[PDB]
Amino acid sequence: SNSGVRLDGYARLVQQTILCHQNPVTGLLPASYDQKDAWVRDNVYSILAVWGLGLAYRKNADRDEDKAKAYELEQSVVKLMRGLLHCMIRQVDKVESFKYSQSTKDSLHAKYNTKTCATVVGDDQWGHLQLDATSVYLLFLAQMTASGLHIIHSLDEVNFIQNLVFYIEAAYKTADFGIWERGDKTNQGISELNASSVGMAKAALEALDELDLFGVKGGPQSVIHVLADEVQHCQSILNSLLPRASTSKEVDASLLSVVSFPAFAVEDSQLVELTKQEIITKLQGRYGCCRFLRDGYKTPKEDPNRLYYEPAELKLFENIECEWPLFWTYFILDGVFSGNAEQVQEYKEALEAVLIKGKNGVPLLPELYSVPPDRVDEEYQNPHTVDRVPMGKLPHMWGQSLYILGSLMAEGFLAPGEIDPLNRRFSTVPKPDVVVQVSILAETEEIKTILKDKGIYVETIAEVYPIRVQPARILSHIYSSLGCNNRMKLSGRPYRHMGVLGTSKLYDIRKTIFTFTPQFIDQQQFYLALDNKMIVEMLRTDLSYLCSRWRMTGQPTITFPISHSMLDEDGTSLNSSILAALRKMQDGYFGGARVQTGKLSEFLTTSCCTHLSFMDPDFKALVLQLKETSSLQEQADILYMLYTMKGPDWNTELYNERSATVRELLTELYGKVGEIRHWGLIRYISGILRKKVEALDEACTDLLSHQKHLTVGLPPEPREKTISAPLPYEALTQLIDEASEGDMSISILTQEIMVYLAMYMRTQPGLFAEMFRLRIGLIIQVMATELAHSLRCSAEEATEGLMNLSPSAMKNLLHHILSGKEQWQRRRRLDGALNRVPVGFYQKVWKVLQKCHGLSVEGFVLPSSTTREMTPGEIKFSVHVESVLNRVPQPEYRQLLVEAILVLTMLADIEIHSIGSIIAVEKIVHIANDLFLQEQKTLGADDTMLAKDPASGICTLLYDSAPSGRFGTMTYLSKAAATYVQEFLPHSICAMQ
Amino acid sequence: SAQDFYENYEPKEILGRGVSSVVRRCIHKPTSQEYAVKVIDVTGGGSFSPEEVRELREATLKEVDILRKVSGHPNIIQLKDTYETNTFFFLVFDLMKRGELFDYLTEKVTLSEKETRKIMRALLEVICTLHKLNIVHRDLKPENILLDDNMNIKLTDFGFSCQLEPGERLREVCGTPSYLAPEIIECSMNEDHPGYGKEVDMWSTGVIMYTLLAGSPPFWHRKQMLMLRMIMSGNYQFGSPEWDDYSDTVKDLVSRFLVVQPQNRYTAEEALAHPFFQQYLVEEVRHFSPRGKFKVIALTVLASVRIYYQYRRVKPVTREIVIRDPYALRPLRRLIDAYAFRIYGHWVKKGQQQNRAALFENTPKAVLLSLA
Amino acid sequence: QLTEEQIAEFKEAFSLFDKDGDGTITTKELGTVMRSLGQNPTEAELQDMINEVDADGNGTIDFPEFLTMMARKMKDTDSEEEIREAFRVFDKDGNGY
């Protein structure tokens, strides 16, 4: 048969190209050339062709030769998988410690040696942090397990795989070296977040959601459990971080590996097409696509025998970057997979020309093409015009294997459903809708009677004996004991909070159905749950979140118990907000989700049920004064001073029958204060207890995903080091405490403001635009200033009122302040304090620096030589300009400098010339102020109108003057700028248009 | 019922917010349309007595009755389907990809002559169509006017509007403080003046025209009483450097639309008859005596000579006036005004306290400002 | 206020300004008219005049634009200057009339 001949030819090609370097005993092929080193990702991608060939051969059964060939191919694939698994197992100690305090020195080495499976390089001579390789290995292991191949052989391997899944689940808030093992464009021993990493990690987590590693013969003890919260967080991260490559790269050719056949970890097909269009526009060439802009790999310069290149790539590698046919193979696979035929033909025709022959006329895929050193200027002057030459590893196993797989799929010998048994091709299918179920219970009989009197039918905590209700802390503690082994020294999953998407699904433990309340209604953890408005708003937000994704199969269920702390003052009826929320839920609509009210037994018939198989079997004078003192605030102050002096954990000996420590008395005081609902000492109590807001790291990474900078506390020069990369929970808490210092409550206020900002980022991601850095301390000072202005009180009274403000009032006040809604002097102070600048301010500043020698801000200088080193779209230039403009500590002066820069930009646009000198914007604003004073004196204003700033030398009327108008500040600024330009011109004007 | 609305309309991302209502997009599953659903709470989270609830229900029923009364007009908004539940109200409208007139106005500062002409024509058509059915809105504001992909404006917020009979006059006062006729202040003084009339929409249209053309409301001040007295006295003035380069026809049309006396205010039909809104395609009855031909030839020669002098009358760059006064150059003034608006473009929302005229300070900040 | 006779005269002038009826005076037709009259304006001058007369950069002048331009007030000195220039152009021959 012709098909048999074609299959035999493909098998011969595979044997002569990839299988020739099988490296028996271990089964890990060398990464081509004279390297003698094995890469996990390279081997995994190379074995894809062998796996596809074996799958194709398996179909033509009923013959001894075909069966033997298929068995040999599957055995080779299994041997490679077992070798890789053993290599990972050899670093169990590293895998276990990475889990706590995620660092670059705690991860397993990405470079694995040849036979004898040892380490080839040290822990500091290479970048041993690549979550993409682990994610792709786990994903393909799951795919082959679902196909039918047997790889896992013992329960210890299952535990190790679970530990690896736990280790990779934290990919959405950590920085790695990426696919290229070089971090950003400049190595400099730095790493940054990559979209490919988190995408492949999410895809691997999705693939291993409930996979059975032992196949059809496996039992309940050999199933991998993966949380859904991490997957949704990674999805949201990718959605909010995929208009470009990363924080530093504007585009990367590796983005295809996220939006194509490998791992299919993307939705919103419009975004996929958009990203593919930009990739084609910015990277496509005559011999493939470039990896990314401004890369110096395999270049005729930059001293190839060097690393950590200095920041001098202004024009050296621009327009002469190498191109890789691997991205063309990616495009071929993407076209041949979903629905495309003509694109496949055109890309195959393009790729056939760039192919170079080998021994016995064998096709070979070169690693990359490089521009000859002689024809360097021609390429820069005429892009994509010169002819490159082959270089790198000529037998590129990755590219050749991918091309072979694509050709086999195009020829029709293989189907898209064979390599993807998990049906990941339909990941872009829109989700029609989802219905969420909410169950309401009464803690006591009185609550149930009250609800019945108000037309609400519910069931108490009792009479539901088959079902049990416990807080999410118990669920977290239970999940912490999964994947625990003593022989291999595995500590299991580290303790972490459980989101709404986790507690919603039902759990079956010991043949009993267990339901858990949402984690956000725990008043013990924090005082946020005390406020009813926060309760209803956060419930609506959680409901919206649940209705949005719900990537898990089955219908959900939310349990909302009614506590005794939400009752009215008389304690006889429910509050208005809770009653309104319950009535809205009864009508089948609340927030942005459709709800139906019913019984837990009714919801039990169809719901998301998960089975946990692993759960199967003078001091005395001070104490007397504290006991006898009134004025509970003074009581809290006394408790604090004894806590700081001699009460860390020592017993106060207040009682005689029972010895109660300071912590017990503190908890009793907190409970007593919670009943009276008085927010005067709650902040002090929380600060003393060192209570931290849950999921603070989640809020931090959500804020940082949009290229934002966070600065805590009041700004002095030395302290308040900026935050640019995600940090663990312990490091974040330590930094917050260090910034807060001895004020204690400052940390609590900072945490509250940070969580409010993170919450408002998701709901309204247009309010926080145009702002590059967020300063919590500056925000606190601004809020205190507005409170003092509104109440016409002192700073101490304003701070006391701010402390006494309810959390809902705090959120409303922060919303109002951020909105900039409620004279001109106060408005300018608010604008300067929050450093609000136009969107195109960066481009205008960059153009001005291009057209001018520099800018003077009365101190230091900003040279124009930085425009070639930087780009307008790069964050480093933006933070440099902000730091240059942040020297002046007056927000009004900052706004004046900003508008002076804007008018100078307008003048430079109008006037075509080169300034060729340093312009002082401080001198410009001084000249404008002098002109305004002269005009006021001429008009007739007296001495009281021509006021003088105590420490800035600027008239108050100038601040109060409106920006636009016949006598606006912009006219004076334009006059002063033109006067300065004339003063720095050769006795003439050079402005025409 | 609510089940039918849920099965037929799918809630989506929020598209707008109100005082007590939220507007979101919806999809009609049988049709796969892209309509919009407006949801307004009844109890408002239990923040008021049931009397407010029944008052709100009466307001919504009046609004839906009025919207059904004027249904079928393509230029007027259309209410396809309405739903009512115990604690939730669902109304279906036509979703529009473009924002309100306020956003476009603050983005473009000042619109072109054709744009303002077509907007004025559409709004005048709205008012005459409404008056033919004896309906007054009394809330003609740019915030209540939106735009679509075809740059066609459609009036919304019919809740304030109520149907009226001949011979009755309204007494309630509502709306933005800078949109009141002298009838309102006369009636609200103690009891003297009878009530509302029909020229409130006339002055509202005049205010819309002035705000859109000049870029700022005709009347604005930092004090409530000061600007109230100013608008009551009708002492509005045209800006010198802004209205100088404008035609006289729009000026006198606006002046007629801002007449303090309700009797002398131009009606809608007279406004349509104005030479601003008339257009001609072709005519063949333009025949007269040779004197008419001679007059036409003389006028043509005069127009040709006038157009022969335009290019020689243009001013050069003239950096001297630029340094002495940057407002002399109209393009430069427009550029600096646009830059100033873009600098503070996030502070133009609903509210009389902050508006477009706040950013402009034509008055000199001198000792004379103290006198009042 | 305008008049019906003035409107008819303006319409006739607009129709006669362009050789072909398309609603626009057109730069080419204006240049041909100028050359026929006996004037040779520069291309840059014509472009500047078109830009100044027009309210935007669309590069086309319409009948309402011409009507608005003709509605401008020249005061007193500009009027006598214009009529003197028109008489001088018309009085090409050395006759004084």
Ligand SMILES: Nc1ncnc2c1ncn2[C@@H]1O[C@H](COP(=O)(O)OP(=O)(O)OP(=O)(O)O)[C@@H](O)[C@H]1O
């Ligand atoms: N089809 C629509 N497309 C876009 N926005 C719409 C649409 N229909 C209504 N809106 C929005 O809903 C609101 C309609 O006004 P609404 O009466 O709800 O608000 P308000 O606060 O009471 O005051 P106002 O009517 O003066 O804006 C506006 O914010 C408007 O932008």
